[PDB]
Subunit: 296 residues, 4 copies
């Protein structure tokens, strides 16, 4: 199987006057490259995929593909939907724009069954010949991809190589890698990055890395080189910022943090997302001062 | 306030050869009309809104509007999205073909805050001047519209007149009606239709009514006439079918039941939704034979 | 079946200098009788059963039995345990001390299976010849008595006549009374007292009634007389006090309220229970402001 | 600080004709000793503490203390209660009988507040001068000891040295050891033994070790030697039996497994505990066939 692993960032999408700040989007991708990030994830959950146009969707994949060209950095483009046929289209259209692989979230809202999840992802995997990483986040989608379906999809479709897990369930990550140790388990939860890596996980798709890419990069590579002492210490050091980046719904805190560090120009979201409360604004701000933030 | 209340049906969308069976859609809406239904809800969750194209969206709202012209039955069109920009368009689009009001689901997947939910629905309500009913289903959206947000939207925007509750939280339904008794609480959960109505609820948007429109209509009208003994008696009789219609995700069981009753032509869904397992097929069929299913 | 229904109070156990204030216990029971209460529950969860000794247990049952002599009030004494041999013993000794019936909590901590719960309660029911009311409170016991187990126990032993439901699950209360309408469903959750009664429940075992016995008495009796309008109106009115009486774990807030109203002399608990935070203390005092508390 | 860490077993309590099989109890404890276990836990949750008398409570501590004399193995006796006055008494009662330390479960059923939990454990710690290990299992107790309360108790009372976590929350296990790395995190959940140990946990209190003590000992000692690959491989091999030992509530499956392996005499529990169904009997019987079960 062809895989995309290592330290990866779920890129935020900066807005300027209600439109995508394309120059800041690319400058932020270059900040990730120069800090040891192995892949960038355009238009993921942290990138506000839900409120971007299909043409803004296309614009930020191209920026990501172009900025990492000539580098070892891959583009795992967000290309998922709760309609399988739309998800198939977005997968084929992400490939046509140079993405090295796709992150495809479990169908949200309409709660498909395990049989439906299998056929949904099976249809996507047969749509393109580039790696496909599953994305399980039941707290946001309202459904769960069971361990059996993940393993079945991994074994039955050749380009499906792993799962991004955001479930706060270390038992499931033991279940997954004990029955199928060949899959690529990816942490989708910054606070528990190290435990997932220490059990055989092979990468991270991080929110914190938007603000602290060097620290997330060091964490993952220490772990992949089995230096768990150094990996655990950065994971322990990052716990406060890892939790405070979820005082409100992602990506509200991380975008607030990037604005407070001066890495984006305006703290703009697209509704129904909005700026945080003024206590969480202040309580994000008080935590950032104990972490050291690299510039451009 | 302008309102749409009473016994309402979240219409299934029958598919035949992968397209919307327009004749059966009309046929079914007239079947609802002739069994005491007060309003129909096209392209709700039970109508597989997520997998229909906008043009399909338009066809079933128009079919519903035309089938109920000249009758008492109202059309509460599904018009919601996890992007406000999109939800405003779908609301206007709905008004545009004669829908009497819109049911607008809480933004799914992207988990807006209470502040974002307020601005989301405030933007929708000021976009149209037809009634807007909120739709809270945290198990599917991953978010909850708090009682404070519901009540504020009810008081701050004149066309927002109530909420369709599908949260299995009778505590919230006393909380809602105790602090704002002028709002229209609508049950989106068939098993507890009577308890919600007995506490002052003014209607249901039902899945079961697709199969047993006469029984659900009678239940609601029994309750609205304060004949709670007869309203509770219909509710108790319906518990078995009300629960078995959720052995798998809605609308998989109800469409199976409609197909087994000979009310639609093929048991077709759009992925990621699919046919049920063979015992839930058997378990839907073995509970269906205990009820009297009205024909055309 | 012999039954104990109507408005019932889970009596708090007042402490003074680490001892049970037997005279203040008798004065709270008298105040319950004179405000329309149909039965009192000594040494329930609200009575701090876990921290009372066996004479205390016996002292408050005898005081309750003697204080309600010459009145219609009945005594449903708490006599349960997560060890079946102790639960049987406490049941037999509750009968020997003049209790009209027993409230038996679902075994806590050790999570018995449905088969174990059946045999547990079957041994209790065969140990005494007084009515037995089951008590399901999964948030505190860690286990749930399923509807089938409750219904099986109701049908197999004459003295098991119903269940005190404290699960915030109006669906389960439809499940129970739809399949076995001869059982006595009793509300163990003040905020949803009216919905449980409106669905055929025949009484409450209340926490708020300690502070506002007349209002809980009026609510319960209005419902049993099918004056649902009046019953919901007291329910809606008490919603604020019903919820804040659980800002901390029961009976911490209710004892704070009784102390703030001057109905007990000292705000004492037995560890691990203690008095609440001073913000919740201040916050309990602020909801009491709109209620009229009866004296002695 | 004095600590009790390493591979530890939550001993089952065998019954024959309704009473504790004292001769088999000693023969199971030495079987644990001869397979590399570092400490045994008499009358814990797996030992059916709730249904043992205080004379069997004293009988099973003395056998454990006496059977491990002249050996390395320590005795961490279960001595807890939801009444602080009983927990203090049982702690002094465990020390006087030769226990090397006490495991004290969070108060069950009566849901103490965080401040009440603090004073509860603070009172216990001053009663004895032997190590105290906190025991958090919210699914059984109905309460959670927060990270702040655990860290406060560890720092304020000299003999409180760590916690036995059974909450399936690896995030909490990062939270605990990142803010207080001197505490002893002990796994109370066999399936996630390795992830908890790899994050700095220093031992397990296991259910599976009753049946496979050598494998749990090797797992813990491989991990404590920072040979995490061999620890992860034993953890992965054990996942199936670790899960099947919870098909029903512990200790129903482990005692069934011990009975099927011929290590105990009778499949007897004390009510409300009971024998499992014939599924779970068959599913325990079929998962055991992949492991090698050491004899006497
Ligand atoms: Mg997220
Ligand atoms: Mg346990």
């Amino acid at each position: 199987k062809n895989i995309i692993i290592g330290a990866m960032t779920a890129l935020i999408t900066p807005f300027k006057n209600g439109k995508v700040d394309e120059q800041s989007y690319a400058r932020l991708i270059k900040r990730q490259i120069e800090n040891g990030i192995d892949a960038v994830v355009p238009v993921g959950t942290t990138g506000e995929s839900a409120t971007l146009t299909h043409e803004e969707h296309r614009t930020c994949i191209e920026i990501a593909v172009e900025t990492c060209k000539g580098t070892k950095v891959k583009v795992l483009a967000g290309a998922g939907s709760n309609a399988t046929h739309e998800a198939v289209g977005l997968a084929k259209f992400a490939k046509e724009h140079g993405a090295d692989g796709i992150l495809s979230v479990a169908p949200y809202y309409n709660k498909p069954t395990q049989q439906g999840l299998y056929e949904h992802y099976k249809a996507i995997a047969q749509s393109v010949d580039i790696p496909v990483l599953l994305y399980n986040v039941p707290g946001r989608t309202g459904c769960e991809i069971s361990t059996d379906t993940i393993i079945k999809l991994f074994r039955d479709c050749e380009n499906i190589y792993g799962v991004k897990e955001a479930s706060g369930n270390i038992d499931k990550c033991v279940d997954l890698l004990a029955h199928e140790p060949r899959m690529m388990l990816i942490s989708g939860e910054d606070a528990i990055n190290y435990p997932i890596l220490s059990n055989g996980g092979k990468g991270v798709i991080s929110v914190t890395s938007n603000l602290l890419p060097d620290m997330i990069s060091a964490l993952t590579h220490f772990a992949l080189d089995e230096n768990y002492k150094e990996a655990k210490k950065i994971n322990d050091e990052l716990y406060n910022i890892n939790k405070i980046l979820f005082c409100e719904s992602n990506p509200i805190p991380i975008k607030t943090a990037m604005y407070l560090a001066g890495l984006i120009e305006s703290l703009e979201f697209r509704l129904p997302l909005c700026s945080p409360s003024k206590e969480n604004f202040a309580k994000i701000e008080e935590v950032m001062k104990k972490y050291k933030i690299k510039g451009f």
